[PDB]
Structure 1
Amino acid sequence: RILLKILLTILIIIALFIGIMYFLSTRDNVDELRKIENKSSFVSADNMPEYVKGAFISMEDERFYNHHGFDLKGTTRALFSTISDRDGGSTITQQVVKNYFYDNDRSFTRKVKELFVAHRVEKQYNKNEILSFYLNNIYFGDNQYTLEGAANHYFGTTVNKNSTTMSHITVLQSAILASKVNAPSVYNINNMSENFTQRVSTNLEKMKQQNYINETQYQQAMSQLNR
C-alpha cells in the first residue's frame, strides 16, 4: 500500500509542476489581438465570405465555434496520431496564441503555458474575432502574414465580401490557403507538388462535407484547379 501513495507524491508533484506553469502564463498579456487588429493589411471575419472562413475552419477545426477554445478529445487523438502518423489537432485558437507568444521555440512545457493562454482569450474575445486574429497573423507563401497580405500578392483578389477593387475571392483559391497555414516551405504556392495538389481537394471536400459550400460551387473549384 505504501506504493500506492508514492504514486500520489509523483502525481501531486506533476500536479504542482503544472501549477507553476500557470504562474508563468502571467508575464504575457491578452491585449495584442487589438494591436494585431491593426496592421499594414487588415480585415475582419464578419466582413468576409463565409466560404473563405470555412476554408480554414473545416480544415483546422471542423467545429470551431462549438469548442470553448479546446478540442480535448480531438486534440488528444491528435497528439495520439502525431506519434502514430506524423501527420489540427490543435484548433484555431491556440494556433494564434502560438504564433502570438512563442514563434521561435517548440516544447511541451510551451505546449502547456499555451493552453492557459487559451482560457484567457475566449473569455476576452468573441469566437469571430479570434478567428480573424488568426488569419491576419500567420505565414503565407512569400513574406505575408495576414490573409489579405497574400490575397493580392498571389490571387490579386479580395477576401472582402464588400471589395469592389481587386476581384472577388474564389473558392478554388481558398483551400490553397488552408494549405498555406503550414504549407511553407517545402510546398510552394507558385510551383506545387503532386501530394501538394492532394490536400486542398481534401480541404475543399470538408467545406463541402461540413457544407460551408453547396455542391455546385465545388466542381467549379474541382475543374479550374486541374489545368
Structure 2
Amino acid sequence: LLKILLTILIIIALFIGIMYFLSTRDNVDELRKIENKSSFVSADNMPEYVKGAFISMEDERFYNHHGFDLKGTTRALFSTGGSTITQQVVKNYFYDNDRSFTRKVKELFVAHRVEKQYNKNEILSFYLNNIYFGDNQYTLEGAANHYFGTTVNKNSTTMSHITVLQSAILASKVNAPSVYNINNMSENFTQRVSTNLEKMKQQNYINETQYQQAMSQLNR
C-alpha cells in the first residue's frame, strides 16, 4: 500500500518532469519583443497610482514573490482565483489561446524563468503592455488614449495625463467579464472599479483626497 501511493508520486513527478520539458520553449526573451510595440511605455515612466491601480487589484504583493504566490494560489484552490502579474504575463504572451491543467502547471515553470531572467519593473511592463482592455487595446497606452484621450507616460507634455479614476477603470477591465464595457459601465462594473479605488487607498497608492476625487467622478 505504501508503494501504491508512491507509484502515484513518481507519475505526478514524471508528469511534472513531463510538464517542465514542454515549457521549454516557449523561451523568453521572446518576451522582449513587446518593447517594440508602437505605443510601448515602461512602468518606471508611469505614475505610481497607475502602477498601483494594477498591483493592488491583481497582484497585491508583486515585487515580493518570485513568480508564484501561494496565498493567492490557495485562494484559487478555493480556501476562499488569482494569477500573479508574472503568470498572467506568461500566459498572455504564450498561452493566450489555451487553458488546460497541462498548461497552468508549465505556466508555473515558464513564469519562474521570467523572474529568474528579468526584473520586476521589466516584468510589470510586459504585463501592462500586453493585455486586453476590450477594444482591441492590448497596451495601457493604447487603451488610455483610446478611452479617455489621456496618457500614462509621466514625462508626457503633449497629451494630458491619466487621472486616478481612469486607472481603476483600466485596471478593472483587464480581468472583468467580457461583458463589462468601459464605454458604458454597468452598476456591476462601476462597483468593481470601486473595489479597486479602495484597494489603492488601503494600500496607500492614493490619498483620501484623491480617493474621494475618483468616487465623486465615478458617481458623476
Q: For the residues of structure 2 that align with 1:159 and 1:195, how far apart are their CA atoms?
A: 26
- After superposition, residues 1-227 of structure 1 pair within 5 angstroms as 3-80=1-78, 89-183=82-176, 185-227=178-220
The separation in 2 between residues aligned to 1:104 and 1:9, in whole angstroms, is 33
Q: CA offsets per residue over residues 45-75 of structure 1, 9 Å max, x none?
A: 1110000000000001111111111101221
Counterpart-to-counterpart distance in 2, 1:13 and 1:35? 36
Distance, in Å, in 2 between the alignment partners of 1:94 and 1:168 is 29
| 2: CA distance, partners of 1:27 / 1:126 | 20
State the SS of the aligned residue for 1:15. helix
Moved more, 212-221 or 176-185: 176-185
Post-superposition CA distance 1:152-179 (Å, at most 9, x none): 1111001011111111110010000111
Alignment: residue pair count? 220
Find the aligned partners of 2:198 and 2:211 in 1 and give their Cα distance.
Answer: 8
Check the 8 A contact 1:43/1:148 in 2, yes or no: yes
Q: Structure 2 unaligned runs (5+)? A: none
| Structure with a larger share of its residues in helix | 2
TM-score by length of structure 1 reads 0.93
Q: Distance in 2 between matches of 1:40 and 1:184?
A: 27
Deviates more, 1:20-29 or 1:176-185: 176-185
CA contact (8 A) 1:141 1:184 kept: no
Matches of 1:141 and 1:22 in 2, distance apart? 32
Identity %: 100
Give the TM-score, by structure 2 length.
0.96
Question: Any conservation in 2 of the 1:60–1:91 contact (CA below 8 Å)?
Answer: yes
1:79 and 1:89 in contact (8 A); partners too: no
Aligned residue for 1:120, secondary structure, equals helix
Moved over 3 A (4+): none
The CA distance in 1 between the partners of 2:215 and 2:71, in whole Å, is 32
Query: Are the equivalent residues in 2 in contact too, given 1:176–1:200 (CA < 8 A)?
Result: yes
